[PDB]
């Protein structure tokens, strides 16, 4: 039998798991950027 | 705990009195002024209705 504690698979994984933080962190800007151009046309227009 | 929550409470109930207080001392001259003008600037800030 394996002389380790089985993996945390839910969360316990590899470095160079970065990947996840490029393409979220990518993903994550692009939204927070159309919701600011959204907030600040929405303030403009609510300005009127 | 008992008194420091007291006064603790006191402080952002004096804070918040302090922010009623100074809406209606800063808006009165221009809810009382005949056909009104306030920028867009101090309604968002001071919480009036939409645009005035």
Do not use: N
């Amino acid at each position: 039998p394996a002389s380790h504690t089985t993996l945390g698979v839910q969360d316990i994984s590899v470095t160079a798991m970065s990947w996840v933080q490029k393409i979220t962190g990518g993903v994550g800007l692009v939204v927070a950027v159309a919701a600011l151009i959204l907030i600040v046309v929405l303030c403009v227009s609510f300005s009127r | 705990v008992s008194v420091a929550s007291f006064v603790l409470l006191s402080m952002v109930g004096v804070a918040v009195g302090m922010c009623m207080c100074a809406r209606r001392r800063c808006i009165t001259p221009y809810e009382l002024t005949p056909g009104a003008t306030v920028p867009f600037l101090l309604s968002l800030i001071c919480c009036i209705r939409t645009a005035k």
